[PDB]
Design a protein around this ligand. Structure first.
Ligand SMILES: [Mg+2]
Ligand SMILES: [Zn+2]
Ligand SMILES: [Zn+2]
Lengths: 177, 66, 263, 49, 133, 394, 147, 56, 113
RNA sequence: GGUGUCUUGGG
């Protein structure tokens, strides 16, 4: 009767929190253990994915605050066999930077991950010794506020390249046309 | 890099107020309560300290440039 | 006719209630307290030795901002108009700092308190760095490690704010008048109702709410204000205001004189 | 990259054909010429030994 | 120098599209078949339904750069509460007595109608208007 | 790309090294300020001076032999402004108007007579916007078959040079043919049509300043009730699509001429969903208040559109990759998330939400595909256009 | 971080800007006309979230595909005494006379971009020519010329 | 390559900026680009004066 | 680079006087003043003080372009008063108001302490 | 004061 339910119980999160097995225990041990498996470009044909682990159970109104998932109205008894980790992991390494990406029009995501990769900033913490043809250090960097859960991994907050200024969206004297 | 001199938008000296702030964190405070005790009422100042990341620790960590 | 009413006061913030004067007059006053009140600040760093990890012009930049006790600054001629050549001790106060984390272990916070006035046209209490308390280390100019000597000399001159953001005596002037819209100068955005969402200003009680049957006074004016001059400490807030007034007097005096000059 | 070259602007190899769910990135890619070709990896791309 | 005079009852006033200017539909009592439509500034002269107005139309308030007035000099306006200026911009001498006159007060309009013998002098270009009460 | 990308100018020497333009001339140059870069030649001797002075100085360039219409309209702000300024309910005190009559360069030096004299003098925007428009014009334009009374205050009648009534926007001073600018050009030659732009821009900017104007997040939000309507509309949409399939996949659909069963099936479903989105957008557009901003600009026509509001607030609809609906990349579905043979619009890409709620996953990926087509298109078709223009000219 | 790019047009000193009631000033004034045609609501939603993040004092979680509404943000905002849809009453700086409209206002995250005005500006009086043609030479760093 | 369209001189490139406080038929050159380029004016029996000025 | 000196905002030029007067030719009894190195801080104030006077008929300033530390004012009173004189009286009044203001603020500040 | 390729970019 585990059916429908995920296989990574809270046991596993606890262990991964300690960092050791309760008689090293990291990622590859997850995979080889039996709770995450790899799918490639093809096998991803013949499987079934729920978006977030909240859609395993047949989910059950009409308040205007959240977003509209499909309820799965085809099968009165479905058969999932895979469930995403978290779909904010479809973006690229230069696109998780966009904060609240999904409230946008894609041509803007595109200009983003084609401009953020030109930010003046602090690229490696040893500009003193490297002697390179260009480099550019911005004086006073600032980790920004609209962080994701991924700048917890791109070190972008220990190494930002941008600043926070008071933006006032209001035509003023026509110089900003 | 090292905490600035003036807050950017307003212009109330913020530099000094850095050390104490870390020290406040050392007791379990909250950034809100901390800032309030450091008496930063507007937010312009409150970002000039709530964001600021201090690099220069790395920039030193290289054994002497000399 | 014009009147004044402090409300809460200390040396840095002075929440006054200038009443019964125009709107432009309060605005002119505000621009004066932020621009044209002369102070005294670092203007020509002359590094003699750096072994920090920080660039040079960088520490130049920071020292260029430091608040300086400038209470007497208004008796010290302008940098471009002193009858001497480049700096003497008449129109400059010179400040030398030089620390050296000697000993091959640990960190040294080269604060601002370490700035020692060398000389200056005294004993006008000028040029010193400014202190919150007297155990107040102050600005955090640099960090040093082993053998990282730093040694720097500074000129300090007297400038206005149009020159730069460092002779900015006062920091952040608050302002507001007619908190209850009773002139209909604004036009509140709203979805469901106006009076709900726009939270009432910190000046609710100082004027009495509008009456429901009250018609629009088509003749009223903005007649009271509330402003709030802060300063980083470089001056004493009352000197702020007193000097804004003096400056503005002097400017209009200059203008009256110019008219008479054509005359 | 992909050396389909640019002799052949047949606009098929440039469109984000539908298996790129999670194997490359829909937000990132250059613009102008290399548009659509120069693909980037999904933050969980793993390439097999 | 009044080139008209009458007294009106306001039948309907619609704000609708504005917060300061409302349109009024006035009809006389001395004589119907003088229909009136006028826009007014609710903040400078509020009105309400089924009230009264004493309308007058001059072509010179005397009894070129407009300065604000002295206190000492005197007007025809000195007996009213809303003295607007405008231009005769349409004078459509139609049937026997459907004579509509359209005067525009700088975005403010005026549909005026009525007896030929009455309006016939309104073939001018400048019409003050002097609402009362 | 057309004989406006080169006009003369005149030089005024200003510090802080970039190029200064005026803002009437972003449109022929079709050059924004996202970093455009423009070459600036120089004459070198007398003949070609006089040639630029008498042939290609912008005043002689207002009317294009392309569509015998003006090309240099009025652009973003100054437009949205000169609408907000000449509603009906604009009133401008005496102080401010002394100024707003200094700014006009062409001005005579004679205040107007203020449309009100008592209780306390005011003025009305239309008069000022009439101070610019040089004496001696005429214009009549009629939308909606309005009267000479004009309840909703649209249309336009301008006599002798003093606006007489009417909300002024793109259709009149804009790039529209037979709009104002055109008329004054024909009626006065170029030089006056030049100083027109000067007058309108200085005025409406300075007034826009002392008014101010902005946008906020709220403007793109709707209340609860409009949300009830819009959700019900799209509800009925998906209901109809289920019915349409229950027909076709029961072998009941009637085939349009020339389209086989599937082409007709898709053509229908597309009519249905796009009509539904149209309904929703129409609801939200008719619903939002007046001083609300998005509606202020759209109605001023500076930027934006209807379909803008239909998406920022109401919905997005279906997504299109080369005409047809979203293909099946994988076998018998668009993703590994739905099963096989699920034509109902959520699968093949009925972007249901509106941005202000934020898309799901699948919808985000689809919408990214659509934008990708947009980019591919923008970066490819330009090649053929350059080629074609080259041939046609040679 | 949403393409709303563009460069500095002009510089105002500290007073001449607008400035709200408390004494804040603006820093960097985009032009609204950017927004309604670009359908980038993320930029507003961000600026809102930042205003909240500074006030309560913690970094706001903008993870996409999560459950953060626009309301819950709005409530948290108004609880701290601010208008729950971003706006604040602002002031003209040249005459103090209130700006008739209310203005959006916050801290938002920009990031400098390379293309500096001294990496494209240029000129050419005359100068170095090729030898194969005498036509003036190619490139910027060589007193080149234009095509 | 070089007889249809060729590189030429007395040009200048840059980034541009908008500024409503102008006329319509005016363009704003920074001071440097103005001191770099030049216009060849010929001296006449009217304008030796300004020209000597530019000399100085 | 090509930015003018950041002190070109207050230092009057050598032979360009502080304040140049030009008589307006359009309407009777009206003139122009070109200020230097001044801003709204002065113009706004002089204007409003001229906007309350009886005999002042029309007066206003504009600020040609912010890349230039100057502006211009235009003045016209009725047939009686030379505009010059009115401007002087306005100066006197603003000075006097401000002297009084200073006086009262000192007195008040010493009371509060 | 090279010149020739390729690469990455900007509008
Ligand atoms: Mg562009
Ligand atoms: Zn601050
Ligand atoms: Zn000296």
């Amino acid at each position: 009767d585990n059916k429908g339910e995920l296989r990574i119980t809270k046991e596993h999160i606890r262990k991964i929190q300690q960092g050791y097995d309760d008689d090293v225990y990291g990622w590859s041990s997850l995979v080889t253990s039996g709770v995450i498996e790899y799918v490639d470009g093809e096998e991803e044909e013949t499987i079934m994915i729920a978006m977030t682990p909240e859609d395993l159970q047949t989910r059950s109104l009409n308040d205007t605050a959240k977003r509209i998932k499909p309820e799965m109205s085809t099968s009165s008894h479905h058969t999932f066999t895979h469930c995403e980790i978290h779909p904010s992991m479809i973006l690229g390494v230069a696109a998780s930077i966009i904060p609240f990406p999904d409230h946008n029009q894609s041509p803007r995501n595109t200009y983003q991950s084609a401009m953020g990769k030109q930010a003046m900033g602090v690229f490696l913490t040893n500009y003193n010794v490297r002697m390179d043809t260009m480099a550019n250090i911005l004086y006073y960097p600032q980790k920004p506020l609209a962080k994701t859960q991924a700048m917890e991994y791109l070190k972008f907050r220990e190494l930002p390249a941008g600043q926070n200024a008071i933006v006032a969206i209001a035509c003023y004297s026509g110089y900003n046309q | 890099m090292i905490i600035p001199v003036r807050c950017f938008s307003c212009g109330k000296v913020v530099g000094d107020k850095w050390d104490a702030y870390l020290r406040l964190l050392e007791e379990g405070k909250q950034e809100g309560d901390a800032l309030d005790e450091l008496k930063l009422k507007r937010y312009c100042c409150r970002r000039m300290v709530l964001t600021h990341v201090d690099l220069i620790e790395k920039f030193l960590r290289y054994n002497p440039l000399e | 006719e014009p009147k004044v009413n402090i409300i809460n006061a200390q040396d840095d913030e002075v929440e006054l209630m200038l009443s019964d004067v125009n709107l432009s007059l309060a605005n002119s006053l505000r621009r004066t307290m932020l621009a044209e009140v002369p102070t005294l600040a670092i203007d020509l760093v002359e590094i003699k030795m750096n072994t920090s990890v920080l660039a040079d012009e960088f520490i130049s930049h920071r020292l260029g901002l430091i608040p300086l006790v400038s209470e007497d600054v208004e008796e010290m001629k302008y940098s471009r108009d002193c009858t001497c050549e480049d700096y003497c001790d008449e129109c400059s106060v010179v400040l030398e700092l030089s620390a050296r984390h000697e000993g091959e272990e640990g960190t040294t916070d080269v604060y601002s308190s370490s700035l020692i006035k060398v000389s200056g046209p005294g004993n006008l209490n000028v040029g010193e760095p400014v202190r919150r308390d007297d155990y107040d280390q102050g600005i955090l100019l640099c960090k040093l490690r082993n053998h990282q000597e730093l040694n720097i000399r500074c000129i300090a001159k007297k400038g206005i704010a149009k020159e730069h953001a460092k002779w900015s005596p006062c920091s952040a002037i608050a302002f507001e008048y007619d908190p209850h819209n009773k002139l209909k100068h604004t036009d509140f955005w709203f979805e469901v109702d106006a009076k709900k969402e726009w939270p009432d200003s910190k000046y609710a009680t100082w004027e009495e709410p509008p009456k429901p049957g009250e018609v629009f006074d088509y003749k009223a004016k903005p007649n009271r204000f509330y402003m709030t001059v802060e300063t980083t400490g470089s001056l004493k807030a009352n000197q702020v205001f007193s000097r804004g007034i003096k400056t503005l007097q002097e400017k209009l005096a200059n203008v009256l004189f110019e008219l008479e000059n054509s005359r | 990259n992909t050396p389909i070259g640019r002799d052949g602007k047949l606009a098929k190899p440039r469109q984000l054909h539908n298996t790129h769910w999670g194997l490359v990135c829909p937000a990132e890619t250059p613009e102008g010429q290399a548009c659509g070709l120069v693909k980037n990896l999904s933050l969980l791309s793993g390439i097999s030994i | 120098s009044a080139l008209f005079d009458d007294i009106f009852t306001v039948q309907t006033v619609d704000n609708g599209r504005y917060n300061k200017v409302s349109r009024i539909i006035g009809i006389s009592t001395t004589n119907s078949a003088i229909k009136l439509t006028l826009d007014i500034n609710n903040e400078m002269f509020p009105v309400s339904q089924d009230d009264s107005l004493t309308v007058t139309l001059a072509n010179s308030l005397s009894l070129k750069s407009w300065r604000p007035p002295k206190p000492t000099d005197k007007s025809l306006a000195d007996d009213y509460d809303y003295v607007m200026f405008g231009t005769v911009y349409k004078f459509e001498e139609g049937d026997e007595d459907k004579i509509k006159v359209y005067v525009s007060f700088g975005g403010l309009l005026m549909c005026l109608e009525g007896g030929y013998k009455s309006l016939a002098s309104l073939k001018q270009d400048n019409l003050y208007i002097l609402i009362r009460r | 790309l057309h004989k406006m990308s080169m006009m003369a100018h005149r030089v005024k020497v200003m510090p802080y090294s970039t190029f200064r333009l005026n803002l009437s001339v972003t449109s022929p140059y079709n050059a924004d300020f996202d970093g455009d870069e423009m070459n600036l030649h120089v004459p070198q001797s007398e003949e070609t001076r006089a040639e630029l002075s008498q042939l290609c100085a912008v005043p002689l360039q207002i009317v294009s032999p392309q569509s015998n219409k003006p090309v240099m309209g009025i652009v973003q702000d100054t437009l949205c402004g000169v609408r907000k300024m000449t509603l009906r309910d604009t009133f401008i005190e005496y102080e401010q108007v002394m100024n707003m009559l200094f700014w006009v360069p062409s001005w005579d030096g004679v205040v107007p007579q203020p449309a009100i004299l008592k209780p306390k003098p005011l003025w009305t925007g239309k008069q000022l916007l009439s101070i610019a428009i040089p004496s001696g014009i005429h214009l009549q334009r009629t939308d909606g078959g309005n009267s000479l009374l004009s309840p909703k205050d649209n249309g336009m009648l301008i006599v002798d040079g003093k606006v007489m009534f009417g909300v002024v926007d793109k259709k009149t001073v804009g790039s529209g043919g037979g709009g104002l600018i055109h008329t004054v050009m024909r009626e006065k030659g170029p030089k006056i049509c030049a100083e027109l732009f000067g007058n309108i821009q200085k005025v409406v900017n300075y007034w826009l300043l002392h008014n101010g104007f902005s946008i906020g997040i709220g403007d793109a939000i709707a209340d609860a009730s409009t949300m009830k309507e819009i959700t019900h509309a799209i509800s009925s949409a998906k209901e109809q699509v289920q019915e349409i399939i229950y027909k076709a996949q029961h072998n009941e659909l009637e085939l349009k001429p020339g389209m086989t069963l599937r082409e007709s099936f898709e053509g229908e479903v597309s009519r249905t969903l796009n009509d539904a989105r149209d309904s929703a957008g129409r609801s939200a557009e008719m619903n939002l208040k007046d001083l609300n901003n998005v509606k202020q600009m759209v109605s001023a026509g500076s930027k934006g559109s209807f379909i803008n509001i239909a998406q920022m607030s109401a919905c997005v609809g279906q997504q299109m990759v080369e005409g047809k609906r979203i293909a099946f990349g994988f076998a018998d579905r668009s993703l590994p998330h739905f099963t096989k043979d699920d034509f109902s619009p959520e699968s093949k890409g009925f972007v249901e939400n509106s941005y202000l709620r934020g898309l799901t996953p699948q919808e985000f990926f689809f919408h990214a595909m659509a934008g990708r087509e947009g980019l591919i298109d923008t970066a490819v078709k330009t090649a053929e256009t350059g080629y074609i223009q080259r041939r046609l000219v040679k | 971080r949403h393409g709303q790019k563009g460069t500095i047009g002009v510089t105002y000193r500290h007073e001449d800007m607008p400035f709200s009631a408390e004494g804040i000033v603006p820093d960097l004034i985009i032009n609204p006309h950017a927004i309604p045609s670009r359908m980038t609501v993320a930029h507003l939603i961000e600026c809102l979230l930042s205003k909240v993040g500074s006030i309560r004092g913690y970094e706001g979680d903008a993870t996409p595909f999560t459950d953060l509404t626009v309301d819950a943000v709005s409530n948290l905002l108004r609880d701290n005494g601010y208008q729950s849809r971003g706006f604040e009453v602002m002031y003209n700086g040249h005459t103090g006379k209130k700006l008739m409209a209310q203005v959006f206002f916050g801290p938002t995250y920009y990031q400098r971009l390379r293309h500096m005005v001294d990496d494209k500006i240029h000129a050419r009086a005359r100068g170095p020519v090729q030898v194969l043609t005498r036509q003036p030479v190619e490139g910027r760093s060589r007193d080149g010329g234009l095509r | 390559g070089n007889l249809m369209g060729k590189r030429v001189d007395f040009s200048a490139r840059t980034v541009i900026s908008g500024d409503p406080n102008l006329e319509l038929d005016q363009v704003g050159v920074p001071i440097s680009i103005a001191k770099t380029l030049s216009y060849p004016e010929t001296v006449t029996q009217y304008n030796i004066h300004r020209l000597t000025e530019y000399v100085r | 680079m090509n930015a003018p000196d950041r002190f070109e905002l207050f230092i009057l030029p050598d032979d360009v006087p502080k304040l140049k007067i030009t008589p307006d030719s359009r309407v009777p009894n009206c003139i122009i003043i070109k200020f230097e190195r001044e801003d709204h801080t002065l113009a706004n104030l002089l204007r409003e003080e001229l906007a309350l006077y009886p005999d002042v008929t029309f007066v206003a300033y504009k600020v040609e372009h912010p890349l230039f530390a100057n502006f211009v004012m235009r003045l016209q009173t009725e047939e009686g008063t030379r505009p010059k004189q009115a401007l002087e009286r306005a100066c006197a009044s603003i000075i006097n108001k401000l002297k009084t203001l200073d006086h009262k603020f000192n007195e008040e500040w010493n009371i509060k302490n």
